[PDB]
């Protein structure tokens with residue numbers, strides 16, 4: 001069967017055949033669309049099929065589908081599974097899986113880059129100190145003094161689900177949140193809870209607006225340990241504006257490395273519950289969301305004040321006006337410091353080209369419109385006018401319950 | 412079976428139950444989500460009729476009463492005997508309003524209950540249709556103080572006697588293909604302008620030429636009419652700061668009046684049913700003025716502002732886009748034509764979801780269309796999970812009449 005997506009700006013119509021390789025469910029039914037819902041331990045029995053599907057895909061990709069090497073490897077895996085009930089991926093298969101998980105990440109506008117991922121194999125890691133060292137090396141490699149390189153570090157897979165490796169932080173580098181008795185928050189409101197768990201674990205909180213959280217790391221299902229990232233490894237950019245000289249006095253800065261640490265990498269039915277990855281930012285993540293969400297640093301008011309916009313009527317578009325200048329500032333600051341960043345116009349155009357190529361070479365590109373369209377200026381970016389089909393391929397990056405909610409404390 | 416919607420900004424969680432009463436099919440499956448796709452008999456009619464009359468008598472707190480039972484029989488006897496049935500005025504008023512209430516793509520639904528309904532089921536000709544439409548335009552416009560309204564022409568019979576308004580809105584601007592290679596006026600209406608000129612319209616061949624109506628009565632051949640110009644309230648576009656803006660020659664019409672949709676009440680189909688409310692500012696400024704395929708004025712405006720167009724990252728598109736929308740809002744306000752901005756529109760809709768969840772058990776909403784095409788995440792709708800599903804009565808898209816009609 002065939003499915004067609006149209007672009008309403010260009011009239012270019014594409015045909016998706018790839019969605020036929022999608023078994024996982026979406027949340028949607030014929031009666032209900034759940035496209036805007038954010039969140040819509042395995043037997044031998046169910047494992048070998050997932051391994052088989054994965055290794056036929058790997059083997060196809062390297063042009064060895066049906067070979068001896070292929071067959072011997074299905075045999076090898078079959079056996080390991082029957083014997084130990086799990087299996088180990090070869091290096092080449094890990095690399096290929098992590099890549100394809102990114103490539104299948106339908107909420108990711110940054111996929112043109114999918115083939116260039118640096119993979120760090122951390123499957124020999126046994127302790128939370130081991131993890132810290134791996135994570136520092138990752139932060140350092142990826143940061144590359146501002147010339148950011150995408151990377152993922154991959155720690156041991158789930159076994160019995162009682163010995164999980166996890167990174168309690170939701171990103172490797174994130175700023176502390178601090179709820180005050182007056183009810184106001186100091187720093188980043190999104191990190192209040194995790195900030196509490198850190199303090200409670202023994203972290204001495206500086207209690208500033210931009211305190212870099214400590215890494216909180218679980219190995220082998222043990223209680224997580226605290227570590228501090230070397231400050232020299234944390235690239236930050238102070239935010240200033242090109243025309244507006246008062247902007248710097250607002251006191252804003254941001255870290256340069258976006259590094260998602262709370263997702264689960266599924267490859268060949270195996271579950272990699274610590275797999276922190278990173279690329280570089282698109283400017284709007286910081287300037288629209290991080291700075292201007294009501295439940296984040298919420299600086300829109302303070303910025304429109306300085307600009308002396310008319311704030312007595314929403315219809316002065318004062319918020320929209322401040323929004324743009326802040327985003328100008330983020331982009332200006334990173335560029336002046338030579339820290340890789342991409343604006344939303346350029347990122348969305350690149351994504352359109354990626355997507356079309358993917359249709360040609362692969363027979364499709366799953367894409368989640370709700371997330372692909374940037375949180376500002378949506379319709380003046382080409383992704384707005386692009387129909388997209390959203391569906392789950394493996395390998396894949398999934399959300400997973402936060403570990404403070406599940407962890408069984410040893411003490 | 413009981414679904415939860417979360418707001419990620421306020422942590423408010425609502426529980427939807429209205430969706431189990433959903434009847435039409437969405438486009439999505441267990442395997443594939445089509446949320447972002449624009450267009451995803453006697454025995455047939457009686458359950459549809461019943462389903463509808465059941466909800467109606469439930470709305471007037473008379474469910475199961477004799478008045479209810481009597482109607483259900485009357486309609487049954489009419490279907491069996493005539494192949495169709497006729498709605499009571501009260502059922503018609505209720506259906507129209509409820510179709511609006513159910514429009515999952517409409518951010519404006521807090522207003523749903525004040526729909527003025529014009530019963531045009533007694534219309535027989537295209538001239539009749541023209542009178543009714545001019546009357547709708549004038550009532551709804553109201554010297555600038557716009558009032559939501561819909562006019563309903565006779566329902567489909569054997570499907571070869573359809574009433575249609577060929578325009579996609581009652582008031583739109585002509586599209587002309589130029590020897591230059593470019594387009595004059597509104598590129599979205601080239602096809603339709605050709606058709607009008609084919610039927611014999613003297614086109615002024617300007618930029619903001621108000622289209623002629625093409626009215627199909629009783630499945631006949633459509634005829635041309637000009638809306639009296641004094642009925643079409645238009646707004647010249649200026650900016651509170653920028654002196655030069657006005658010299659772009661921009662204007663827009665006050666009354667958005669969707670006229671190509673099909674209204675389904677209780678299995679009966681009303682294929683000509685233009686309705687109008689009023690504009691949310693982003694509709695004109697962001698979409699009509701700025702879309703590559705529309706009036707596409709970003710380039711021109713950026714130059715008058717003298718911003719660095721050398722590179723995307725200066726956000727010059729974004730800068731000009733804002734001020735274009737300031738101008739639209741300011742201009743409508745200065746002329747006292749109702750318009751609403753996207754902040755206020757979305758805020759109002761969040762209030763309207765809460766009331767609907769509290770009062771009806773839910774609210775079908777299509778996030779893709781609800782979120783303004785500019786500044787999404789600073790509007791509250793961005794952070795609101797919504798569930799999209801199809802309830803009836805409904806407004807539905809339908810094929811352009813020219814693809815279908817035979818002369």
Ligand code: HEM
Pocket residue numbers: 098102105107108109110111113117150151152263277278279280281282285342347371397
């Ligand atoms: C070139 C650098 C990249 C850019 C500019 C980029 C851009 C983005 C953006 C803007 C989002 C959504 C933003 C948000 O709301 O959080 C996103 C989501 C995502 N990205 Fe990328 N990304 C990049 C690299 C990567 C890498 C290296 C991976 C992993 C290999 C990745 C995997 C994902 C996943 C799994 C999501 C969904 C996130 C979630 O569900 O919370 N991205 N990306």
Ligand code: HEM
Pocket residue numbers: 511514516517518519520522526559560561669686687688689690691694751756780806808
């Ligand atoms: C009075 C203030 C109103 C506001 C502010 C408003 C706002 C909107 C907006 C922004 C859209 C998005 C569609 C687009 O951007 O093209 C929309 C769509 C829609 N509205 Fe409303 N509207 C209003 C009145 C009405 C009325 C009176 C009706 C029906 C009687 C209605 C029914 C619909 C329907 C059916 C759609 C979807 C049309 C389509 O699929 O193209 N609205 N509305």
Ligand SMILES: Cc1cc(N)nc(C[C@@H]2CNC[C@@H]2OCCNCCc2cccc(F)c2)c1
Pocket residue numbers: 038039110258259260277278279280281282399
């Ligand atoms: C509840 C929930 C579910 C889910 N899947 N995800 C979340 C993370 C939220 C989404 N929106 C804000 C925050 O996301 C913050 C992390 N976003 C970074 C994506 C990115 C960009 C560039 C390079 C990269 F390597 C990665 C929360």
Ligand SMILES: Cc1cc(N)nc(C[C@@H]2CNC[C@@H]2OCCNCCc2cccc(F)c2)c1
Pocket residue numbers: 449667668669686687688689690691808
């Ligand atoms: C192909 C196709 C399908 C569809 N459902 N719709 C279209 C009209 C396009 C879509 N999106 C913009 C334009 O529609 C024109 C603007 N729509 C007006 C909605 C509205 C607003 C305020 C008051 C009202 F009474 C009505 C085309």
Ligand SMILES: C[C@H](O)[C@H](O)[C@H]1CNc2nc(N)[nH]c(=O)c2N1
Pocket residue numbers: 035036037038370371372419793794795796797
């Ligand atoms: C409810 C809604 O799906 C939610 O707010 C989404 C909308 N789109 C988004 N898009 C991105 N990139 N990141 C987000 O966190 C969200 N939030």
Ligand SMILES: C[C@H](O)[C@H](O)[C@H]1CNc2nc(N)[nH]c(=O)c2N1
Pocket residue numbers: 008384385386387388446447448449779780781
């Ligand atoms: C592809 C996508 O469905 C299409 O661009 C939609 C997105 N959201 C929209 N939302 C509204 N209100 N109006 C539109 O015309 C569109 N276009």
